Enzyme design. Structure first.
Site, PDB file in Angstrom:
ATOM      1  N   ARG A 230       7.965   9.568   6.939  1.00 28.98           N
ATOM      2  CA  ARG A 230       6.880   9.750   5.985  1.00 28.98           C
ATOM      3  C   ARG A 230       6.460  11.212   5.875  1.00 28.98           C
ATOM      4  O   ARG A 230       6.304  11.739   4.775  1.00 28.98           O
ATOM      5  CB  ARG A 230       5.668   8.908   6.387  1.00 28.98           C
ATOM      6  CG  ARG A 230       5.640   7.504   5.802  1.00 28.98           C
ATOM      7  CD  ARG A 230       6.065   6.451   6.807  1.00 28.98           C
ATOM      8  NE  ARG A 230       5.249   5.246   6.671  1.00 28.98           N
ATOM      9  CZ  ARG A 230       5.426   4.133   7.378  1.00 28.98           C
ATOM     10  NH1 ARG A 230       6.398   4.058   8.276  1.00 28.98           N
ATOM     11  NH2 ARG A 230       4.620   3.095   7.190  1.00 28.98           N
TER      12      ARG A 230
ATOM     13  N   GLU B 177       2.177 -11.372  14.284  1.00 26.50           N
ATOM     14  CA  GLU B 177       3.023 -10.905  13.196  1.00 26.50           C
ATOM     15  C   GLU B 177       4.502 -11.240  13.330  1.00 26.50           C
ATOM     16  O   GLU B 177       5.251 -10.544  14.011  1.00 26.50           O
ATOM     17  CB  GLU B 177       2.866  -9.392  13.016  1.00 26.50           C
ATOM     18  CG  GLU B 177       3.798  -8.786  11.977  1.00 26.50           C
ATOM     19  CD  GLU B 177       3.576  -7.300  11.791  1.00 26.50           C
ATOM     20  OE1 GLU B 177       2.826  -6.705  12.593  1.00 26.50           O
ATOM     21  OE2 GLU B 177       4.155  -6.725  10.847  1.00 26.50           O
TER      22      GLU B 177
ATOM     23  N   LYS C 114      -0.174 -12.451  10.545  1.00 26.75           N
ATOM     24  CA  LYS C 114       0.300 -11.377   9.668  1.00 26.75           C
ATOM     25  C   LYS C 114       1.740 -11.709   9.290  1.00 26.75           C
ATOM     26  O   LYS C 114       2.690 -11.275   9.946  1.00 26.75           O
ATOM     27  CB  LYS C 114       0.242 -10.014  10.379  1.00 26.75           C
ATOM     28  CG  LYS C 114       0.622  -8.841   9.477  1.00 26.75           C
ATOM     29  CD  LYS C 114       0.509  -7.495  10.191  1.00 26.75           C
ATOM     30  CE  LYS C 114       0.940  -6.361   9.273  1.00 26.75           C
ATOM     31  NZ  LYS C 114       1.074  -5.079   9.970  1.00 26.75           N
TER      32      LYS C 114
ATOM     33  N   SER D 219      -3.123  -6.626   5.181  1.00 27.35           N
ATOM     34  CA  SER D 219      -3.003  -5.854   6.407  1.00 27.35           C
ATOM     35  C   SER D 219      -1.898  -4.895   6.014  1.00 27.35           C
ATOM     36  O   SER D 219      -0.781  -4.951   6.532  1.00 27.35           O
ATOM     37  CB  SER D 219      -2.559  -6.709   7.587  1.00 27.35           C
ATOM     38  OG  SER D 219      -2.466  -5.896   8.745  1.00 27.35           O
TER      39      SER D 219
END
Lengths: 351, 350, 350, 360
Positions: free
Chosen positions: C42, C187, C229, C300
């Site tokens: 990123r 998750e 999640k 989320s």
């Protein structure tokens, strides 16, 4: 975490003794439990009418073979009908079998049924009223039973559900049998259909048997009082790659060593379509395999013991002797094979 | 229903060869993998300060006993600290063990932790970064490992959760070990604590081992490249009913025959609080049991091989010879026991 | 068959209260728990050196966004590093998050590890010392946590082993969290990679969730004190068949309705690669789906809340307000989406 | 990990539509599927001879009550025998049931059998030839079925095996039913027998239901095309500690919320020995419980709908109207109960207050 004994010491002794007599050194099982529908195609292969008398005559032909089969046959699996028929002299067939040293077996499942949500997979039915049936069969001369589950190797099979369900139904069947003094032969047959190779079959067999024994454990099954009737580990029928009998033996014995507790009294292989001679050579190679084998490795053959006899008979009474001679010959060959003494004359880390 | 080989033929051979060397006929395992914490009470009982040097000395005492122990010891399990210590001659302990014909083992679990929602039951941790740790231990001389799970027989224990969870983590540990050329010793210890009888222990042992092997199958564990370190089947430590060594042997061999696939290379029994003599006598009766046993039935003793040596040493350097002498005696005794050649001086009921 | 309460009434109330605050009407979660390594790409995309300072500044940028986000953000997931960093004015980030009405969360897993014998499948590690870490995190401001398991749809995946192992580790993580007053976000992400269609994803999501909840039950997990999640139900990235957001919504809601017990306090969807606008539009459709949904259906989001902001920032402090404005816009859009009020301007078939 | 649709969209629609009609708002199920051996003691108590005609008559009495029960009864479970009997007017009972807006159900299990190696635990049989039986029952007017599994709370029960085996057979039964357009009512009954308390029953009920739904998922069961018939969460019948109706409702709804997927169309509680009034009151409290309930919460009462009727009948033909009236009263009360709108006054009668509990 608490025990509530399913069986008493006396019940265990009876089940264990029965299991050992069936697979005693040199002995195997004659699987003659084909139903009317199953025996239909076989009777027509020799152009013979499928009547009860013809089925009686044929079963009689096998069961009354001369004393040479006595040390070869530890047990005989019968279909319901045959269990209640009699030889020409009026002797009930089970009496005939016992007089020749064999233990009487009875097929008790009620066939396969489709499992919804799977790619043509099945489970097996027959638990309803099974306890009462076992009690009656025991009283009528039977000491062991057979229940067949069928699994298939394919794109997405055997699936998780098919493995779990078939394993669970076998345990229930085994449990009911032992409560009635009947030794259950657990038969989780993995069909040989397909183009898969030897290692694929071995992998699947390994996973199937692991599930089978975990289920037997959960259902508190007395292993010493049971027998296992598995497929030998071989390539699929349509497999392009070729294998030797030594490789088939190594793969088979390795799969068993990795999953079958030594407590299991014996392994009685099904021939699953193999020719009479092929089934004998393979069984012999299995017994010759250079690996430790804590259980008897013998046979429970249907087709592999009757192919020639059926043909030699042709449905003609005059052929009785010729037909019996063919059956006796296969009984002898396999008797030697389950001892690794068979002869045409008469890197395990890669698994 | 599809195979994705976890191991190559080469990796399998390596693991199988290692497992067989550890449990070769007449050989057993010396479990000297006590942590500073567990060794604390040991040294304390003999008024010996628990320093790093004293631990090094004591381990040296055991690891350097005379060659009489060579045919008795197929493997030695060490604690991290010890794997990196050296004997007085500068020789690192792994080298000392190997030069005596022994395989080096390393304890890799990080202890038990409580399972919430159970009556004091536990699972074991230590999977984090275990792969890198194994690769390093391998480079440093270790060829096998040990991971201990603890189960307890009680009113409501071991529970379904405890059995399933402990079985699963043992499989994870085994999987990671084999990927790094380390033979995993699977240890699902059922404590002898309690007043339960022999049949109860056999029942629970059978159920736990069935769970363990199903888990190992689900995780694609190569059994020929593993060893089993179970509790012997014995009555509870406080059981009022008494049994003979033959009954314990029959119960133990029966439980194993009903759950341990013949492919498992060996079974190395833990002593679990049994005296040195008792542990040797039971191991002997086990090997003399009139039933077929397709795997080596030997030992992986900690206390049962050190009890006397520790007391004879007493923390005094001048008692080195005497201390080693006691260890040798127990090594010789158990070497004979795993062959059924040791002398101190109706299976349907199971 | 016997209960041994894992939690007291007080512990339950605390967990339930926390869980409900995070997913209160109109609120969602800002997932800003990227590790140095996972945020590297990123930062590289915007030519920004991956240093603790730039990371601290970036997180500060998001956490200090103006009050407009307050009613939009019920919780914020941080990475270990950020939990202990401070804003320019000296205020600890956890304090900043709380002063704006949000609950502080912390990632606690230690990444995925390969599962031997599978076609590239994984499980997740991180249980070692987790109890101690959770107690420390609780003491330092965190009230909930996150643990990510990853499954993949392929010819033979997810396999029975992968589904079972990942469900089990999620249950262990959940148990440990609840013992320390931390609400666990479960998750079980099923990657969108592949050319599989929508019904394939739905089938797999249903099977995975059924496994997850049976595992949570086996491990005595207090569902009211947890959050789920999951991935939304969508076709694979390479699938050539096109679907409307209403179909993605129907498939997602149908899958949840068939596996998630009503007791589960909330479902906080991961964006899993979807664009900012796509994630909002889908969440909106999910909330407008006709079927009855007994749990909160919110977000989320990590990437779906940071894309435009990270770009507007470009590592330039001068772009602070421009960057925050982008984040604020998505926070507002998703707050409306989780209520079925966002506008960018035969269920039997499932 | 690959799908092989057990059902087509059409089959799913038919199953879902049936399930919804059975538990439509204000509607419940009359469970009159007692076997000859089961309904034996019932008839015995009222000095009535257990003949086929008496059974036929009694069933006709319930099935032909006036139109006031129509809005109350979404379904009626029958025993094989009754499914093939006719009322005095020649009309087959299934037709009588349908004409009143009810769905016809059929009991298909063949009873419980002992699980070897357990402390008196059982599993249930009846899968053999079930597919053919379902296809036939379907052709004969039945649209849903019932299969009963029985678990018991004790020191070692229910065991891991009992839970797993019963959950598995229920799944097989449900799979075969759905393949034949029959909605299966999954009944994993946890007996009230024992002195355990409320939380113990809640705990066991939660573990049992989680096991049941995992099995249903494993067997690819279409939940929207199924119904759940569980025991309410209550203390053991011999428990010393007492609880309010609100606590029983809370424990029941909580247990359900933690295990039953929203996709399940409805939960039809079994009365399990509770008195007629007690069963109605509890059902009412359950429906008024503050917690969110994504599924219809109604009834599938056998004893709780027939107690007073049987007593009012007494085997006397002249007491037809009297007996039916009692049944209508219980049906109306439960119809309101499954809407949380029931409020007893005091006219139920001593027969509706008697404990219908029977040990095993």
């Amino acid at each position: 975490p608490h025990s509530h004994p399913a069986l008493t010491p006396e019940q265990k002794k009876e089940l264990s003794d029965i299991a050992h007599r069936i697979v005693a050194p040199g002995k195997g099982i004659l699987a003659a439990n084909e139903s009317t529908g199953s025996i239909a195609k076989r009777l027509q292969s020799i152009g013979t009418e499928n009547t009860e008398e013809n089925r009686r005559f044929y079963r009689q032909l096998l069961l009354t073979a001369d004393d040479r089969v006595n040390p070869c046959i530890g047990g005989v699996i019968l279909f319901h009908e045959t269990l209640y028929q009699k030889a020409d002299d009026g002797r009930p067939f089970p009496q005939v079998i016992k007089s020749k040293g064999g233990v009487v077996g009875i097929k008790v499942d009620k066939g396969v049924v489709p499992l919804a949500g799977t790619n043509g997979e099945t489970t097996t039915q027959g638990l309803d009223g099974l306890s009462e049936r076992c009690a009656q069969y025991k009283k009528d001369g039977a000491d062991f039973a057979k229940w067949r589950c069928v699994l298939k190797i394919g794109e997405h099979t055997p699936s998780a559900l098919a493995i779990m369900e078939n394993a669970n139904v076998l345990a229930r069947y085994a449990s009911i049998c032992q409560q009635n003094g009947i030794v259950p032969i657990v038969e989780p047959e993995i069909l040989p259909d397909g183009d898969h190779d030897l290692k694929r079959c071995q992998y699947v067999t390994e996973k199937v048997l692991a599930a089978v024994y975990k289920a037997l454990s959960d259902h508190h099954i007395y292993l010493e009082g049971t027998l296992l009737k598995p497929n030998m580990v071989t390539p699929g029928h349509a497999c392009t790659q070729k294998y030797s009998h030594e490789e088939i033996a190594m793969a088979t014995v390795t799969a068993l060593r990795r999953t079958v507790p030594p407590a299991v009294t014996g392994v009685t292989f099904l021939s699953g379509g193999q020719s009479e001679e092929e089934a004998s050579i393979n069984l012999n190679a299995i017994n010759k395999c250079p690996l430790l084998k804590p259980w008897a490795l013998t046979f429970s053959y249907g087709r592999a013991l009757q192919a020639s006899a059926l043909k030699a008979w042709g449905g003609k009474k005059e052929n009785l002797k010729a037909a019996q001679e063919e059956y006796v010959k296969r009984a002898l060959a396999n008797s030697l094979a389950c001892q690794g003494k068979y002869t045409p004359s008469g890197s395990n880390h890669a698994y």
